[PDB]
Amino acid sequence: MEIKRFGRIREVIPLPPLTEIQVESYRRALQADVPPEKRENVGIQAAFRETFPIEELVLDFLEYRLGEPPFPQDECREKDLTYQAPLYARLQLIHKDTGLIKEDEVFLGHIPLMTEDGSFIINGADRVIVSQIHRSPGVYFTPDPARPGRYIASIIPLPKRGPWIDLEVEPNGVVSMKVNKRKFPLVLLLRVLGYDQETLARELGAYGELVQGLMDESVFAMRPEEALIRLFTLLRPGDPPKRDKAVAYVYGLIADPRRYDLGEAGRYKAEEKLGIRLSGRTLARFEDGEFKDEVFLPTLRYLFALTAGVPGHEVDDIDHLGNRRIRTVGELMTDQFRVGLARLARGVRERMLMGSEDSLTPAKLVNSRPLEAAIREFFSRSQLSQFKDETNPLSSLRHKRRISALGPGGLTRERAGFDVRDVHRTHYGRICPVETPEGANIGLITSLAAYARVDELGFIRTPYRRVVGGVVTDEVVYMTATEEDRYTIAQANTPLEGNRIAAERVVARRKGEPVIVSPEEVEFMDVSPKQVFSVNTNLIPFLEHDDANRALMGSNMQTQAVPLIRAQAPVVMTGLEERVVRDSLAALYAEEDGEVAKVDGNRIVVRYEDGRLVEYPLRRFYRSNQGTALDQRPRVVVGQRVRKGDLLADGPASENGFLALGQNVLVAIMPFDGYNFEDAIVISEELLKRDFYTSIHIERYEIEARDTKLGPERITRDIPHLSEAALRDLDEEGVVRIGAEVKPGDILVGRTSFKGESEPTPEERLLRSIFGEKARDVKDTSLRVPPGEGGIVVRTVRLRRGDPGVELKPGVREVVRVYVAQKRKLQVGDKLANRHGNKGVVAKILPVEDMPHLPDGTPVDVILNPLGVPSRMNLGQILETHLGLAGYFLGQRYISPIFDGAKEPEIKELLAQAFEVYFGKRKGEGFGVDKREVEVLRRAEKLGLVTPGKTPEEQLKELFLQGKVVLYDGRTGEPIEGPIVVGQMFIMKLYHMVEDKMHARSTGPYSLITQQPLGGKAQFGGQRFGEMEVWALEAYGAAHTLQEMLTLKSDDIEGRNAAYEAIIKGEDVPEPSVPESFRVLVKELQALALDVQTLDEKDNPVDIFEGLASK
Amino acid sequence: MVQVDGGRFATSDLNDLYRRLINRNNRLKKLLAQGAPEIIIRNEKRMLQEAVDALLDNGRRGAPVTNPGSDRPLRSLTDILSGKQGRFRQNLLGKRVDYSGRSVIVVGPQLKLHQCGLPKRMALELFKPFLLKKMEEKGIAPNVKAARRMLERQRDIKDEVWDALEEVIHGKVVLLNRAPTLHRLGIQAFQPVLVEGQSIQLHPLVCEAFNADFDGDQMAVHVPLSSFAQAEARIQMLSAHNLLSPASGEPLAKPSRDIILGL
């Protein structure tokens, strides 16, 4: 079909590699494809260089190398393995006394490898390392909140890389330095650095009254050694002030590059703010036996010049994106690598003392367990390491571009006020102002802008076109916020004739401030509107017409869209739906030009120009992390000529290379019998008939048979006391057969466990005697289908003990996995949503005959209530519906770019072209205007919609240009008394489905200590009746219902047992007893040496333990 | 100290704190019996005091004692008693309960004010013992054990048990609740109408008191068991009996949205 795209803005550059923030970060961190001699001192190389040489025998580092993965990605996902590469390090042990050298390559374990799409495979599960925003290290100057005319100087290194130092001018006049919560006069530390009164007087004397507050005679009287011992006594009281100890401590605190590490960005920010040059990333140096200052004097000078009001000195905006930087995958992984390496170095140093001081190899000296433990900890249990969101490809694409202010080394939720969550003016082009979580995490979790990229220092940069004179060049400069604040940047929609600015007045920004400016003052220009918003936000057509609060929900809900079996791209696109499928490697493309040799459901074989025959296998019906089916379908035919970059196979939720998160349905905006009341949605049974919004979902079940002290657990078809009807679909070994239908209660894998030793009750003795049948040795522990689940068994995986290639955790004989899939049709309670924030649950599925329908008999698909539009102020869906009506009758789709798309006149023109097809067809078919159409036109000209006096066709066209049509009620056949908006809308089926969320419980599992029911549907748990529900029951005065909640329905053991027996016997429920959690409270208070006594009216003790706890 | 599903062992931190205490106490006794100098005895006594402090209220004084290879402070008795997760607020002033369920809500315009749509399977589970008794009264099962064994498998469920469940719930009411429960009308009593499907059907007029809408909200259902609880729910808690706000005295169940629009 035809695809019409609007907009006159020409983007000089395409979108960057959307997952490059992960890929390039990790590639720079590993440096695997760089030959070891040509590596830079970065990442793993920097960590090794920092940890070594280990001095004490001297152990030094030469070079590392990374091997090839022992298993591929698919095998890792299959076998619960980490996709990783072996790490080796060539170390030479040197004896500086002997000169002896023993060199060896030691194995340091494995390091997880990032896949092509920017994710990891940890213990079989896909995971993403979310980038972390934080304060950039450096030297900042903030206003002192207590004293207005004063300021605080803050020296901040990298996280975990040293203390924060605070320089302050105390009210008494002396300058204080704050380190590790202790304060002292900065003059003492300056004296340790070797400064004398002459130097300070000549250096800082230009700022009048502060240098005298800096002067202290007793400190200048004593030489730097006495000052060093004095400072050590101030910082470490009680520690005997041995001079070498003081040297070591002060060096490790300030001058040690191993214990103190300003950022490379920190060094750059310090050099740029103070106007100096750093020889390293420490605040001072230990050179020629003494201490030499680096940072302290420039910072103190800047502080004094700022306090004195010396011009050219400013305070720092700490939320400015020039002072806030991103730590990506490589940096966090390298930090944990460095920690593990330091622990390994401690082990090495301890080994260089014990044992034989002569016979030692690098292999004997190195224990790699700390390093492996640190890396495994980071990748498995860190907060920034998250379960990959692969609901649809866009889910993972967005997940990889996430930015978190939380996590280790960052904010807690209470530490986050309004300042951090705010949208800063420097977020322009860097951080999306729309896409952020609704609720407690708002402002803390954000998304990277579309055109943004993180530089090597960690600052987000955005592109701008250079403007010389009045001409806009095609050269683009990626700027940081700090450099962006220098220029006057015009908007991307400023009129142009050629490369020349065609407007006499342009809209521009100066330090984020909007301004009207002459074309001679234009230094740069925006690349595109797309650069201001994230990837998800850039997929919302007519975004300029949607309120931001609802566009947020649209962006966040595109993530939750479920891949449909008949998924299709929207009729109104933004132009990004192809590129998203491209960069999220779900779809398959051709490497070079060539011809398709073979097309199968499982594979595609292509013969390229090179003559080489390349076979691409297709992922078919694979289960994602969230249960959605990831499967690739071939889009080419045998003998087809393809070019470089042509589509070969469609991934999940993609149609011919375009992103397909939902379906295009014929929607009518009107109330309907209160079934769309309060955002609810009414749908047509025709949607289920033609399998719209039907999705495939796979669930994974697992069971282990292990060795017990009572005998082995066995996976077997022989299960005690079971009928052949129960064992029908199990094979010889006890595993359910592939293709069988399983429902709740059915057996997936049969298993027997040896009965725990137990004396049969006398009742069992008499029963056994009556029936004369021996009680079996084993008990039925088979895995069964939980309530509400089931489907078709598509796969079984079995792993035993003693078969080639597999080894389980200790004690486990065998493990069996069963994969069950299900085709889910749309039903009542499932959640739908569009890209504009309109979301609702399906409340009614009507038969086709009850659906409102067009005059030509076409029924609508979805009925949306118009009451959801005015308060929400998201008009983008309305324009989408109008343009979708136009494209529905013209048989074409559209690309309406963001902030530069189809405007109302063009939509009116397309609607006229569509009305011609919609009505002249009828008129040629030999039919005139309907009677009910005439009545609707009467009521419409009463509404001022159509001009009175025109022909019925002219008035119907006037209505059609407004996007409204005559609609017939399928129940009566009479029309709706007014013209109604009808058109094609793109609606998605979200991951929230009633089938997953419906749950109920009579009785079930209880907790160990509290004896209260467990929680969760997965544990068959009960609903929590919290404090506020108790408040509700109290305010109602419902005492017995509340007491049932507190006793019979939970943790009153006698009470609940007697209640169940009474109800199954038809008797009324008994009087409740003492809640077991109260006895738990009594005993836990006794463990705190407190006597809690229940007393009667006579103040006599009452035993709620019934003699069981008293001797 | 319990053995979990896979045969692994899980234990409370109080055991480790008690072990610290007992080790230090026995070491102190042995050091006293062997006549150690006063420096050693003093160190041991101070360690014993620190261990008792750790057992009673860890982190109260000094650094919190942690398990090896972990920064997690061990959970002492004081931590068990106090806090949002403490014994009082988690297990005494509120509990998880039996005979309760939860599902996504859907607008039920055809409902009367005192009614709510309840899914069939939810009702079968919530009223399960009443249903067993009714299936024993009628000839559906020989006894309660056979009725339960029959309800266990979903394919063994015939259509007479649904009529029996209709007979069971006759006249009775259930409690619907939506979090957050800001005022007493966050819980309301409704007569259940059994419905096919998995969604709870809520009356429109009560959506304002629950602050409920249908963009994906879920509600919890509870079954008052006794005749006393059922009477309390039908008389005091019934939706149709609470039409005015206890705060302002104004009508709370009143026309809104589409109703106002049409009128």
Binding site: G238 | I39, R42, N43, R46, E50, G62
Partner: peptide, 14 residues
Amino acid sequence: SDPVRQYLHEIGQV
């Protein structure tokens, strides 16, 4: 407040 430092100080007195 630090038991290790206190014990080391007590040890340093002999």
